[PDB]
Design a protein around this nucleic acid. Structure first.
Lengths: 181, 42, 283, 214, 127
RNA sequence: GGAACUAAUUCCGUAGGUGAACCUGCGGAAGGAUCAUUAAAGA
RNA sequence: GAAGACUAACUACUGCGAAAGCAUUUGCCAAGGACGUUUUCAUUAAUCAAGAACGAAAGUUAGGGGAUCGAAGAUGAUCAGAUACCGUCGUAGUCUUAACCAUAAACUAUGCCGACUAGGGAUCGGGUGGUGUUUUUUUAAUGACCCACUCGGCACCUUACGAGAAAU
């Protein structure tokens, strides 16, 4: 009565996760009771569920989601949050999705999301209680659905070339109208 | 209320716990310091 | 809502209106009542049409207790949806966006106002008065122009506002043609609309569009159903037979290679007659 | 007031003789009725099963196979080869940055005159001591690699009857002869068949299909 | 061990499709979506609804003769978003914990060797 | 109508426009505020 | 299954072109720079009024094409606001042939040819040198890689015995 889910691990995010590995697998195997094998040669994490030691069928699915969250370049603490809270989901989109940008136009666009010293990127997460990853052309979001929808609109407003200030306005508008509720 | 650009030390799991769990926890400790100082002044 | 920071300008608009002491003046968009108070002293009645209830209340307050208060009537709401009374002359200072519907409401008003003095944008106003042989010249120009003659009266720089607008502003005068020429408005507009969609592209190019051929055929088939005239069997698509009929009309009248951008009112009247006489209508 | 499930008859699907497990899956039809029957529907269906489910072994996690149904015999419907794919997730991981990708393909015939177009992909690998990260070949390199791959593929397709190519692909001998003739041009890593499709099969021949099944 | 079918989850925004078929695909077995289990238009995609549709689908799934299932999750695709909708992972999470033993799940969103002009124009769409 | 009773971001080129205090499509420019991580053929 | 457009990811402002510009692949056609060069000619050259070749998007003439997006036009509702002023239909157009126009912040917002003045590590192309590495077969030959050098590229770093109002 087993179950086997196998997730590929990206090479760029492979080193940080392997280094924290010792902090990584214990909350799974010990707090959730699960089997976490790791094939270094194939760079693939293997999550197996034992019927005798697994109380919840959903926990095996939850473990795969936690590994993927860290896979997407999120923090270990953020990955831990996915196991703890169900309402937390990840959204990924391509800048080319919202507005076809070439070369430097794309580059600068990314900066408008990050901002000087991350200031533009950090403000959206705090006012939307979320976690964002700015990969290449991919942007990832992590958090509650209602939180992510507001965060996605703010990120899209940036990627459309709207000035950061305007986005701050919309941001404190939304964060106010939601933290109020 | 003004949003803070500086990264929140509390994690997403941690912020939810605070919501899951006087006027304010920081403001009362401001009020408690400042009355201990005033009685020293008097 | 912007205000005229130029107090020595309203006087020129009032002069160009050529007020008689017996006149009923329609003022559309009175704003804070800067022109209204001056109009009231020179005319028999001022019918002021204002959308904003706040501005209407302030306007009542401004004339309150003055000897000319009783000669002001304030009509509240959207002027487009307003049944307008008789008026001898009109002054306008309403938002530019309405200006486009508003002109054709004034032109089609039953008994047209003898004269009107209106504040539009620099581009709109230039279109209203544009003549054939001009790049601006278009449907608006010719639609407005057949019904009445329009004169461009002064240029108004943006700095004469508080706050100032981005585009430059002017004042064009419109006098309704009396009596207006006996041509159906829908028929005149339909022929004019097809040619302009591309002024530079010849008439024969404008009438070779699929949609245009379909329209003109359907209307010719309607005319022939009305008069009991038989249509010979079309070898294939009807639009191909109507193509020959449209091309014969354009060749007969000398219009195949002519363009809307350089055609006058008499040119359009002649072309419309040539299609109508052959049983082809644009309405 | 009907219910579709309580009318159809369950059927059994059997994989080709040259496979680790003959058993594959079950399907729903519609009672063989006078006028429109269960016999006609089963013949044209195909099934995509990952050969790791079909070989057991996991060193085969990618690589998907098309099994088409051709003949049927009472609760027992057989299948033959209909193509091979890769997996989308495996393909995405292989396309790493700062390396040349190389693809080549040929349309070619077999013995039992199926006609097919087979694919092939490979990437330039870094020399295990190399200071420079990009490790990009030289177009002249690329041109030559494809011509040799193209050379090797046409040799395998003509030699293989159809089923033999099947027996040829599974242990991936193709993948290695490539690397062998190649390593004299430029390094290269991965190197797989990647995808093969069928586009012109001969004629039924009920006799040949029975021979594959055991 | 089990009887295998195919799960196949299309999760776009503004709605999430779950529906299981025979392993060949030709003959299906029960569908139901997120638009079906709430009425509000605006709430057609949300995980809450997908969970409800995962529940219904699980019922009929085991009501016929299916006990297990492989899933093929999928976004809109084409010249569209390319990213997984909200209620697709939530539609799989609610389907995973239902007894139906799973096995091997890949992504199948249609991705072009790019082209056909995207919609929206130079200005672009959603804001 | 009468008479009782109760109740109480900026810009360029180009093209077009009838809800044009100007806007919109196509292509450009910046004369517009880069945080974070980054050897994993780490055979 | 059809139609037309496009060439995602790899992608690198690198790499190529006089510039506009050029990104699936293969075939053909002619072209080019750099390098190598104990080859050849021997001043044939530099820069250029006049004159001429090419030239992004839109736009124009005449055919074709007309999937998409979509100036014009017509519409949606217009609520408290507009922090989150768009949505729909869609003509021309967008693509192609033959011809026009003939200008862009056509920008490094910096004539051309040559010659001198200062340091460093990367990289693209070419060539030279090595009892360098790796590929095995029986050593080679190849190839890819490493080190030193040298022409010619696209760039960055640090600075001055230099320049500037200062960024540089």
């Amino acid at each position: 009565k087993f179950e086997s889910r196998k997730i590929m691990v990206p090479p760029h995010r492979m080193t940080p996760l392997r280094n924290s590995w010792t902090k990584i697998y214990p909350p799974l195997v010990e707090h959730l009771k699960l089997q976490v094998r790791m094939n270094l040669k194939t760079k693939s994490v293997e999550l197996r569920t034992n019927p005798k030691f697994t109380t919840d069928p959903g926990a095996l699915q939850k473990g795969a989601d936690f590994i993927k969250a860290f896979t997407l370049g999120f923090d270990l603490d953020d990955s831990i949050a996915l196991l703890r809270l169900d309402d937390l989901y990840i959204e990924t989109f391509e800048v080319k999705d919202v507005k076809t940008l070439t070369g430097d136009h794309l580059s600068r666009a990314i900066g408008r999301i990050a901002g000087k010293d991350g200031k533009t990127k950090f403000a959206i997460e705090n006012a939307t209680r979320t976690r964002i990853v700015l990969a290449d052309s991919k942007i990832h979001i992590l958090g509650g659905f209602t939180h992510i929808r507001m965060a996605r609109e703010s990120v899209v407003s940036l990627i459309l070339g709207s000035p950061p200030g305007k986005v701050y306005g919309n941001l404190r508008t939304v964060a106010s109208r939601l933290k109020e509720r | 209320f003004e949003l803070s650009d500086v990264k929140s030390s509390k994690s997403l799991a941690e912020i939810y716990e605070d919501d899951y769990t006087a006027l304010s926890e920081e403001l009362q400790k401001a009020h408690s310091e400042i009355s201990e100082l005033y009685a020293n002044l008097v | 809502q912007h205000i005229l920071k130029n107090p020595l300008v309203a006087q020129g608009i009032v002069d160009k209106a050529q007020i008689r002491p017996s006149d009923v003046v329609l003022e559309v968009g009175p704003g804070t009542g800067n022109l209204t108070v001056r109009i009231l002293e020179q005319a028999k009645n001022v019918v002021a049409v204002e959308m904003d209830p706040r501005m209407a209340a302030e306007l009542t307050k401004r004339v309150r207790g003055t000897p000319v208060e009783k000669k002001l009537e304030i009509m509240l709401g959207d002027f487009m949806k307003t049944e307008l009374p008789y008026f001898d002359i009109c002054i306008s200072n309403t938002p530019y966006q309405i200006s486009s519907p508003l002109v054709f409401k004034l032109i089609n008003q039953p008994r047209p106002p003898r004269v009107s003095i209106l504040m539009f944008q620099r581009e709109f106003a230039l279109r209203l008065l544009a003549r054939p042989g001009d790049s601006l010249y278009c449907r608006l120009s010719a639609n407005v122009q057949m019904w009445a003659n329009v004169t461009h009266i002064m240029k108004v720089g943006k700095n004469n506002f508080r706050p100032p607008p981005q585009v430059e502003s002017s004042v064009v005068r419109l006098e309704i043609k009396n009596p207006r020429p006996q041509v159906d408005y829908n028929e005149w507009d339909g022929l004019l609309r097809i040619v302009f969609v591309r002024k530079n592209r010849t008439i024969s190019a404008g009438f070779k569009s699929t949609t245009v051929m379909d329209i003109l055929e359907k209307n010719y088939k309607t005319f022939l159903a009305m008069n009991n005239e038989m249509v010979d069997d079309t070898k294939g698509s009807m639009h191909d037979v109507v193509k020959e009929k449209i091309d014969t009309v354009l060749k007969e009248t000398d219009l195949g290679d002519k363009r809307a951008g350089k055609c006058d009112q008499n040119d359009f009247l002649r072309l419309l007659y040539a299609f109508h006489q052959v049983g082809i209508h644009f309405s | 007031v009907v219910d579709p499930f309580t009318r159809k008859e369950w059927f059994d699907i059997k994989a080709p003789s040259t496979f680790e497990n003959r058993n594959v899956g079950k399907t729903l039809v519609n009672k063989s009725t006078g006028l429109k029957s269960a016999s006609d529907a089963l013949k044209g269906r195909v099934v995509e099963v990952c050969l790791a489910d079909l070989q057991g072994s996991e060193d085969h996690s990618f690589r998907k196979i098309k099994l088409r149904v051709d003949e049927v015999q009472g609760k027992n419907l057989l299948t033959n080869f209909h193509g091979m794919d890769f997996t989308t997730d495996k393909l995405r991981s292989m396309v790493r940055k700062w390396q040349t990708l190389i693809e080549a393909n040929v349309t070619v015939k077999t013995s039992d005159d199926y006609v097919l177009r087979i694919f092939a992909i490979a990437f330039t690998r870094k020399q295990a001591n190399q200071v420079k990260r990009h490790s990009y070949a030289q177009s002249s390199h690329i041109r030559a690699i494809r011509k040799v791959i193209s050379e090797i593929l046409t040799k395998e397709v003509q030699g293989s009857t159809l089923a033999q190519l099947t027996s040829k692909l599974i242990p991936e001998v193709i993948n290695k002869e490539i690397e062998n003739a190649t390593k004299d041009i430029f390094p290269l890593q991965n190197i797989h068949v990647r995808k093969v499709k069928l586009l012109k099969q001969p004629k039924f021949d009920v006799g040949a299909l029975m021979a594959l099944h055991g | 061990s089990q009887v295998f079918g195919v799960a196949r989850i299309y999760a776009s925004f503004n709605d999430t499709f779950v529906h299981v078929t025979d392993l060949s695909g030709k003959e299906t077995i029960a569908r139901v979506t997120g638009g079906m289990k709430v009425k509000a238009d605006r709430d057609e995609s949300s995980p809450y609804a997908a969970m409800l549709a995962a529940q219904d689908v699980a019922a009929k799934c085991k009501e016929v003769g299916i006990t297990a299932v492989h899933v093929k999750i999928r976004a809109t695709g084409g010249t569209r978003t390319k990213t997984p909708g909200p209620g697709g992972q939530a539609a799989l999470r609610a389907l995973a914990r239902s007894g139906l033993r799973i096995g091997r799940i890949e992504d199948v969103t249609p991705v072009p060797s790019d082209s056909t002009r995207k919609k929206g124009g130079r200005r672009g769409r959603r804001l």
